[PDB]
Design a protein around this ligand. Structure first.
Ligand SMILES: Nc1ncnc2c1ncn2[C@@H]1O[C@H](COP(=O)(O)OP(=O)(O)O)[C@@H](O)[C@H]1O
Ligand code: ALF
Ligand SMILES: [Mg+2]
Length: 737
């Protein structure tokens, strides 16, 4: 039942270059359930005939203008080679946004197309009636903002994808849309502090990665109070799981956080001498092979984050205090912890000579008591029963504790700047009804994946479980429980991999936590208990190469191999109490507030707990999903890799979405919410307290004269199609006094 053009799985140009997965060919002969003789044209290289079975042949969508179809579902033929070609043609014409049911897909162009300027914001925000432009992320922003004010219910925009897909860039674009309000008038200062925060959060939190030159090394969540006619009034920012290990070491092709390069390269000579700023090559903490990020002007961002500090109401004392801590964090890595005498195996740690001259100058930059810190890095008081002993630290421990100071100072400074931001911006009353935004670090894969990547990929798995539960599991169950539709909706879940990773027991994070709670623990003993706590699952497997320390997980985006070397050390990377209480007693105001109020606390345990707390908040809101896709690995514009596109389409469930059109209606809201959203259609039916909400909704629907097939009444909700929601919003045009 197919036309004259087919897509081919077994073709000459696809068997020769499997990365491009399909060829388009015109059928010259054949029959139903017989072999077909056809020649391919879309790769014009092969001008000769060949044969293909009846299978491995899909319809083409030959006559469509792909620039006129905004949704994948609206295409006549929605098979894999059609969806791939549909997104390709639109992407080659610089149209990257394409909707799929509630989902919206955004493909990285790797260049500013100019489609997010202020003129585009105005055209998507205030064009009368409804959105009849092309799909966009401004689609999501306006629909979510309209839903917010129409029902008084919190919404949450959630971007997703892999590293370098455009999650953060889409987030910044939606903030620019929300911040645009030419209809009303407000005080600019709070909104300007929110927008000016984006540079400093990317300076302190982002760094060059082979997968993304501006990779966010932290997750971001934002609650927003967006005005009715646009404009941002209040907000709050939360950053979780900053990767402190990046402060110490980096791969050869990567950089540390941008702020180190902005400072060393952009600081004036007076500032360099003031905070003892060395060139980047003379910092052990800075990878000297890669000092340049292709898309970033480090000197331009340096003056950008300097002006941003003023918009966030940081006094000149605090700004100078921040640069001192940044330089102090860098200089601390130059302190060599030399091995000294009076050690058991000549292993005792100490700082001497030129290292102590550097150590004193670094502590002064960090505003710390030098000799009190030095004692905590060198001597270790222990208790063999009732015997107090002033033993020494081995060189290994003293060096880790020294680097631990630099990481905690940088980690807490990043949180303190955000906390300074929230004090100036958080709403005076509180957050009851808000606009949520989630900017999570995406899936990432390297030749060597440590705990930094393990946590990041686990966050992405939990989001997908929350995606599948909300969009597929809850929706399919809700329709059946309402009596609207009994449908056999089948999909791909990640419930088994999320269990063997995050459960209370019989999971990787559980085996990690128990290993760190032991007096004597090893990375290999942690992987050992993983191999047998539960091995009856294909989601966890011992790696094929070096299986004593390496393991791999069968993720939703493929298989990823991790190595446990350093898991315990990195999972227990908390500043010691005896060192933390020294930086608390600093006479410098900002340093004294970094650890203020502090007197279980493992990263993996305190980070999964925050994820659950954030999952509970977000699920109290109505979610909107943006699926960001990276079309190539070379970051080249107009570069299209069909094999990579298809992997992300399965991972983000863009193809599996299309089932949702078969699941009845697109609008589903309780009777009371519906009567409030369209109350002016029949005020006698909506504002009558002595009425039954199902009859009142029916009276309002029958007053709207909406056709019968465009709505339905469930047991406790009113369902209606995409056509019915458009009309009711339009009918609310009557003018009351
Ligand atoms: N819509 C877009 N327009 C132009 N460039 C983009 C767009 N989305 C992503 N990019 C480019 O891709 C890079 C990575 O985007 P980013 O949002 O950091 O990815 P991630 O999803 O990892 O946060 C950015 O530096 C930017 O240059
Ligand atoms: F900056 Al990313 F995933 F690389 F959010
Ligand atoms: Mg990001």
């Amino acid at each position: 039942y197919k036309g004259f053009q087919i897509w081919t799985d077994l073709a000459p140009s696809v068997k020769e270059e499997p990365d491009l997965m399909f060829a388009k060919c015109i059928v010259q002969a054949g029959t139903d359930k017989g072999n077909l003789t056809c020649v391919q044209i879309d790769p014009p290289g092969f001008d000769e005939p060949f044969e293909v079975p009846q299978a491995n042949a899909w319809n083409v969508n030959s006559l469509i203008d792909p620039m006129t179809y905004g949704d994948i579902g609206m295409l006549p033929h929605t098979n894999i080679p059609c969806v791939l070609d549909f997104l390709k043609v639109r992407f080659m014409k610089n149209q990257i946004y394409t909707t799929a049911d509630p989902l919206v897909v955004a493909i990285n162009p790797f260049r500013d197309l100019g489609n997010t300027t202020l003129d585009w914001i105005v055209r998507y925000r205030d064009t009368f009636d409804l959105s009849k432009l092309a799909p966009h992320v401004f689609y999501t922003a306006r629909r979510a903002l309209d839903n917010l004010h129409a029902v008084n219910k919190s919404q949450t925009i959630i971007v997703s994808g892999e590293s370098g897909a455009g999650k953060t860039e889409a987030t910044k674009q939606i903030m620019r849309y929300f911040a645009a309000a030419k209809t009303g008038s407000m005080d600019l200062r709070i909104q300007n502090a929110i927008m000016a925060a984006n540079p400093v959060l990317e300076a302190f939190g982002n760094a060059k990665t082979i997968r993304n030159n501006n990779s966010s090394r932290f997750g971001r969540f934002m609650q927003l109070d967006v005005g009715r006619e646009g404009g941002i009034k209040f907000g709050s920012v939360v950053a979780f799981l900053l990767e402190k290990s990046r402060v110490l070491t980096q791969d050869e092709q990567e950089r540390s956080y941008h702020i180190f390069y902005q400072m060393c390269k952009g600081a004036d000579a007076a500032m360099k001498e003031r905070f003892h700023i060395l060139p980047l090559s003379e910092y052990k903490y800075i990878n000297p092979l890669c000092l340049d990020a292709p898309g970033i002007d480090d000197v331009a961002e340096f003056h950008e984050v300097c002006e941003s500090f003023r918009s966030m109401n940081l006094t000149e004392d605090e700004v100078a205090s921040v640069w001192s801590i940044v330089s102090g964090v860098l200089l601390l890595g130059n302190v060599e912890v030399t091995a000294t005498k009076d050690g058991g195996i000549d292993d005792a740690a100490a700082i001497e000579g030129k290292n102590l001259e550097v150590f004193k100058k670094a502590c002064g930059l960090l505003f710390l008591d030098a000799e009190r810190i030095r004692e905590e890095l060198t001597v270790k008081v222990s208790y063999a029963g009732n015997q107090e002993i002033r033993g020494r630290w081995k060189q290994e421990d003293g060096d880790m504790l020294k680097s631990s100071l630099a990481k905690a100072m940088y980690d807490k400074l990043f949180m303190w700047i955000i906390a300074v931001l929230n004090r100036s911006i958080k709403p005076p009353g509180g957050f009851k009804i808000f606009m949520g935004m989630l900017d999570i670090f995406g899936f990432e894969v390297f030749k060597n994946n440590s705990l930094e990547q393990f946590f990041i990929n686990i966050t992405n798995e939990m989001l997908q479980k929350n995606f599948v539960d909300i969009v597929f599991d809850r929706e399919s169950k809700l329709y059946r429980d309402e009596g609207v539709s009994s449908k056999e909706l089948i999909f791909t879940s990640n419930a088994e991999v999320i269990k063997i990773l995050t459960a209370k027991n019989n999971s990787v994070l559980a085996a990690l936590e128990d290993q760190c709670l032991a007096p004597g623990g090893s990375d290999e003993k942690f992987l050992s208990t993983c191999k047998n706590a539960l091995k009856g699952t294909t989601k966890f497997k011992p790696a094929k190469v070096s299986p004593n320390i390496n393991f791999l997980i069968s993720h939703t985006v493929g298989d990823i191999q991790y190595n446990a070397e350093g898991f315990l050390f990195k999972n227990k990377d908390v500043l010691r109490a005896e060192i933390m209480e020294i930086v608390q007693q600093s006479k410098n105001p900002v340093v004294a507030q970094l650890f203020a109020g502090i007197v279980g606390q493992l990263i993996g345990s305190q980070f999964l707990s925050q994820l659950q707390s954030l999952m509970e908040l977000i699920n109290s809101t109505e979610p909107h999903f943006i699926r960001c896709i990276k079309p190539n690995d070379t970051k080249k514009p107009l570069d299209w890799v069909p094999s990579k596109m298809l992997i992300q389409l399965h991972a983000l469930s863009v193809l599996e979405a299309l089932q949702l059109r078969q699941l009845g209606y697109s609008y589903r809201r309780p009777f009371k919410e519906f009567l409030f959203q369209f109350k002016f259609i029949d005020l006698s039916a909506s504002e009558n307290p002595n009425l039954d909400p199902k009859e009142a909704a029916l009276r309002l629907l029958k007053s709207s004269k909406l056709p019968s097939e465009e709505y339905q009444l469930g047991k406790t909700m009113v369902f209606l199609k995409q056509t019915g929601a458009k009309e009711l919003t339009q009918i609310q045009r009557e003018c009351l006094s």
